[PDB]
Design a protein around this ligand. Structure first.
Ligand SMILES: [Cl-]
Length: 214
């Protein structure tokens, strides 16, 4: 019944939103590493999030904060965009609210080597209210860590894509993330010695188990 082949076909599709997110992150880091000023970066980021598709829903640039600045509005200067049209949000730069430099997705990438990517736990962004997984990476300027870039994946969009693809291939699938959270479970069950095909994504530390659908 070609289960292993169809499971590989499904894994290739599941890899697409994740490879897509990595590519967008590479574009974000190019912008963060550049000599463009704040307004030029805002324009490029707005354009970038306007053209990207798939499961990508928000993200942007998170400069290393200056917590010692006397003006509270100068401490945090993230460039964060949300795909509704594309809106720029300032909500994460609220000094009263702790800023962003202690968030899991910032800390994972902080001062890490360029070219490494980090995947957050599932969470609901407190300002866009979208349930999401974030991929992040550091960027540098003049040899020094300068900030974190992020891309947010819509969990709802990811679920729909994986389930619809598995249905098309007449498969059931469970997809778990690196924290053991069940991202998607679509028509998956085992009985009467049903074969299960397992695949581990080596770059993302995610896991799928696949069965034939009846
Ligand atoms: Cl689900």
């Amino acid at each position: 019944n070609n289960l292993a082949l169809r499971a590989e076909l499904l894994a290739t599709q599941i890899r697409e939103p994740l490879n897509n997110s990595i590519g967008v992150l590479q574009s974000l880091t190019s912008i963060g590493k550049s000599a463009a000023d704040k307004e030029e970066q805002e324009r490029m980021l707005r354009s970038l999030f306007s053209v990207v598709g798939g499961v990508i829903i928000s993200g942007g640039l998170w400069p290393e904060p200056n917590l010692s600045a006397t003006d509270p509005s100068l401490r945090y200067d993230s460039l964060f965009f949300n795909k509704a049209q594309v809106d720029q949000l300032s909500s994460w730069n609220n000094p009263k609210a702790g800023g962003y430099d202690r968030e899991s997705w910032y800390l994972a990438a902080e001062r890490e080597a360029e070219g490494l990517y980090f995947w957050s736990p599932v969470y609901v962004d407190p300002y866009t209210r979208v349930e999401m997984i974030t991929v992040s990476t550091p960027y540098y300027r003049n040899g020094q860590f300068a900030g974190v870039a992020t891309v947010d994946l819509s969990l709802e969009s990811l679920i729909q894509f994986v389930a619809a693809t598995a249905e098309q291939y007449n498969l059931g699938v469970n997809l778990k993330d690196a924290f053991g959270v069940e991202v998607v479970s679509h028509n998956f069950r085992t009985y009467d010695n049903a074969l299960v095909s397992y695949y581990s994504f080596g770059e993302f530390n995610w896991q799928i188990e696949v069965v034939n659908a009846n």
